[PDB]
């Protein structure tokens, strides 16, 4: 399956899916231990997968490019999604993210 | 179709790029995909099979990214950046790559 159409679970994880987390620009940052052995399994999928845009969402919100390198031909994306201040469950979502982004830096 | 938080609304007719959206243009968080075409049609445009085949999953998009989170005086933000390779073995690599060019920056050429 193409990289980017993949789903990590239990049986294919996150590291067989979309490589080691770590920091280099081609890199993945995204996911303690237990999320890489689960991905969607993972039990805080559901409050992880509410900021992963749709399709529409993601060549709408984003900003595209294209680059060529000795690789190959490469869709490149940036872009930003706000966090709803006013949910009730906003606090418990900036815990989750930040145990997560760059959370591999602490692996053993 | 407003109601849903910006990153899970889907583009009609109906509910267009822009009013979904924003208008493209070339600011650092503004999106610059699509022309007049796909701007007016969102998911109902007649190739955007052949654009979603590039969009990620839900799981690609937190395993294959670069992921932040950043605190400004507009809120909080859940920033992005990756890549995704195009197939160069694909017989249709070529109308891919063209298909792609002919909405990125679109925008430029027309009001």
């Known amino acids: 399956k193409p990289r980017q159409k993949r789903t990590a679970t239990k049986a294919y994880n996150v590291t ?8 280099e620009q081609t890199q993945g940052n995204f996911g303690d231990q237990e999320l890489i052995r689960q991905g969607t399994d993972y039990k ?26 000795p690789s190959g031909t490469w869709l490149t994306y940036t872009g930003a999604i ?3 201040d006013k949910d009730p469950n906003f606090k418990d979502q900036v815990i989750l993210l930040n145990k997560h982004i760059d959370a591999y830096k602490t692996f053993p």
């Open 16 to 23: 067989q899916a979309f490589g080691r987390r770590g920091p």
């Open 44 to 69: 805080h999928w559901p409050q992880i997968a509410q900021f992963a845009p749709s399709a529409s969402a993601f060549f709408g919100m984003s900003r595209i490019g294209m680059e060529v390198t």
């Open 82 to 84: 706000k966090l709803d």
